[PDB]
Amino acid sequence: LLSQANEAFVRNDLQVAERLFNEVIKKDARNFAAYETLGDIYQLQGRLNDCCNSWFLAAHLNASDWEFWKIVAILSADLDHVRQAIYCFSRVISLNPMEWESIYRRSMLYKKTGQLARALDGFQRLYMYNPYDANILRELAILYVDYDRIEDSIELYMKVFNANVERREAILAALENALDSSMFPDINWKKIDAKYKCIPFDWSSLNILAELFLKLAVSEVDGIKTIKKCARWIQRRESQTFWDHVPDDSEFDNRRFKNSTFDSLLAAEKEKSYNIPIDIRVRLGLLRLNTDNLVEALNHFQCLYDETFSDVADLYFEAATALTRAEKYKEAIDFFTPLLSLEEWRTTDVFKPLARCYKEIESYETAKEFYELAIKSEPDDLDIRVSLAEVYYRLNDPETFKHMLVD
């Protein structure tokens, strides 16, 4: 008689029908289809949560419809209750270990909740399933950094690199043979694209590496030697091994024409990109400035001068502030000073260090001017005081006692 009570109800749609549909199974508890009916209605009336708790129960009657949990999990993630969402996802995954979507989604709700041990052990898995997804690669590289392992995040991009070298050698030996047998060569790609596949290494990759060598802040000379080996492989210059054995950091500069072995190179090779993109070059500057080589770091930063200024202002600033932190003051002022011309940069952010730089070179006259401008926008004490110390050193005490108390 139960089956009749439910049947009459399920057939047709009215707001009284579906709750009375619950009332019969209210006598005795469990019907899987009962809930799937419930959710269908709650979803339509447009109130989200009741829809979730109905289905969220349904999924327990049949533990085995995992396409179903995945829906209940993405809905608990949509309604912003996470602990359910990760739990539902974890059933989808105990049923199906290879479900990619749910391992990923779950493992990034793991990230938001800040269980990294789980979220890492999570993206690692997807990266095992498919090594060639670039999104997964980044997401994994990132967690490694947040998890305070930079060293692992670097090896990760290094393999991608080598994988690209192995593959280029394959294609080069491939058509070195194709001409012997044989009117052009025909290389068989289906065999190549299957045999060596790893993700393309382009400048973006090398930049992502560069930033990883900064965050490490260790053995910074090894980082530089490598940024150069890779940047050199790109631009098909890997042929020239010698650059590995000189300190100058001299390639990627005109300095390379004073080179003994370079001169002897034929014209074909002499013409090839010896230049590197700016976001990376400013990163070699920083990376050198870490080793307190200001002479080399400077030659990199000086390259900002050849880029259209409005395009990279933020780099001028980052360099200037990097010199300020590295306590090289005479030079910082040179990468601060241009930001002044563009209106949006005139702020305490630029004005404080500019001044402090001047105060530090023992020219206090001009340093006054900036702390003043800086004090205007922002009412802060820390850098009003340092303005006293400036009115102190250039003006000696006579008629400086009034100013001090005034401020």
Residue numbers in the entry: 131 to 312, 337 to 561
Sentences from the paper on this structure:
Recruitment of Pol III to these genes requires the essential transcription factors TFIIIB and TFIIIC2. The six subunits of yeast TFIIIC are partitioned into two DNA-binding subcomplexes (τA and τB). The binding of these intragenic promoters by TFIIIC permits the assembly of TFIIIB, upstream of the transcription start site, which subsequently leads to the recruitment of Pol III, the formation of a PIC and finally to transcription.
Given that our crosslinking data implicated the TPR array of τ131 in connecting τA and τB, and the reported importance of this region for TFIIIB assembly, we determined the crystal structure of the TPR array (residues 123–566) in two different space groups (P62 and P43). Starting from a construct expressing residues 1–580 of τ131, we identified a stable fragment by limited proteolysis and mass spectrometry corresponding to residues 123–566. We were able to collect diffraction data up to 3.15 Å (P62) and 3.4 Å (P43) resolution. The lower-resolution structure was solved by multiple isomorphous replacement with anomalous signal (MIRAS), using anomalous signal from crystals prepared with selenomethionine substituted proteins or native crystals soaked with p-chloromercuribenzensulfonic acid to final Rwork/Rfree values of 20.9%/24.5% The higher-resolution structure was solved using selenomethionine substituted protein in single anomalous dispersion (SAD) experiments and subsequently refined to Rwork/Rfree values of 25.0%/28.7%. The structure reveals the presence of 10 TPR repeats, while only nine TPR repeats had been predicted. Rather than forming an extended super-helix, the TPR array is instead separated into two ‘arms' by a central region that contains an extended helix and a disordered coil we call ‘ring' domain. A superimposition of the two crystal forms and an analysis of temperature factors reveal flexibility at TPRs 1–3, 8–10 and residues at the extremes of the extended helix. Despite crystal contacts in these regions, the accommodation of the TPR array in these arrangements in two different crystal forms suggests that the conformational changes are indeed permitted within the TPR array.
